[PDB]
Subunit: 115 residues, 3 copies
C-alpha cells in the first residue's frame, strides 16, 4: 500500500488532500480524499501542481468523480459534483457549479478500481 | 479486522466492492463500499451471487443504505439512494431511481454498527 | 495516535460514532464518523455528553460539517447538512432540517485537517 498527502494553498484558502493506492490480487484501488474546506470566492476550479506521489493515482483515462455539499444560511443544501483530473503535473478539481463563498464544503472521497 | 473485495460484471460494465468487519468489545462495524462506476444502461438494480467474504457483512436485518450521485450533461446533480440487501446468496443493490447511462456514478460507502 | 467509539442512546434510538486522530508531519487529521441510523421522530439535534476521547477531536473553532441522506417514501432523496460542535462536554449534531421519522439515514464521515 502506498499513500501520501498534499496541503494546497489555492488563492487565500487551504484544501487538504490525501491519496492511497491499495493493491490486491483482484484489483488496484486508487483513493483520493479531501477534508472539509472553506472557499473565499465563487470557485469553480481548484488547480495545483502535483508531485510524483499524487500523480501516481491518475492511471485511468477516467477522472475521479465524487460529490460534496454546502449548507446555505436558509438551511437548503447544495450538492456539487467534483471531477478531479490531471494534465501533465497539473491536477484540476472541477465543481459542477460555483461554490458559495465563506461556507464550509463537506469532506469527500473518490475511489477508482482498476481490474 | 477482516476485509475483502469483489469485482462484479453486470451486464456490460463492472462494479468493484470492498467490505470490512471491524470488531471491538464496544461494537462490530460492517463496512461496504463501492468504487465509482459507469453504468451503460438505465439500471435500477445490480444483483449478483455473493462470495463468502461479502456475505459475512450481512449480519443485521436492516439493509445497508448509502447515497451516490451523477452529474448530468447540464451540470445538474442527481442524488440516488443505494439500498444493499441479501436474500440467500444473492446481493441486490437497489438505486432509488434509474441511473443515467454512460455517466459516472460516484463512489459510496455504507456502515452498520452492531452493539 | 488516537481512536475510539461511542454508542449513543438518544431518545428511543441508537447512533454509533467513531473518532480518529491521524497525526502527521503534513496533514494532521481529525475524523468523526457515524454509522447509518433510524431516528424515530423529527429530530433536528442529537446531543450527549462526551468523554475525553471523543472531546479530543474538537480542537478547531470550526465545527465538523458533513452530509447525509434519507430515501423518502416516493423514492426521492433528501440531503441534510450535518454540523457537529462541542460546548463544554456536550456534543451537538445539528441537521439542516428535521429528519423524517422511521427512515434510515445514511452513514457519514467528517474530516478536518489542522493547519
Amino acid at each position: 500500500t502506498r499513500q501520501g498527502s498534499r496541503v494546497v494553498g489555492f488563492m487565500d484558502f487551504i484544501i487538504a488532500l490525501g491519496w492511497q493506492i491499495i493493491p490486491s490480487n483482484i484489483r488496484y484501488i486508487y483513493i483520493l480524499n479531501c477534508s472539509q474546506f472553506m472557499p473565499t470566492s465563487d470557485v469553480t476550479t481548484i488547480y495545483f501542481q502535483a508531485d510524483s506521489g499524487l500523480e501516481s493515482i491518475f492511471v485511468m483515462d477516467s477522472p475521479f468523480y465524487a460529490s460534496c455539499t454546502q449548507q446555505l444560511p436558509d438551511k437548503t443544501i447544495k450538492t456539487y459534483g467534483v471531477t478531479i483530473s490531471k494534465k501533465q503535473s497539473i491536477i484540476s478539481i472541477n465543481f459542477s457549479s460555483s461554490l458559495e463563498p465563506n461556507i464550509m464544503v463537506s469532506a469527500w472521497t473518490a475511489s477508482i478500481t482498476r481490474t
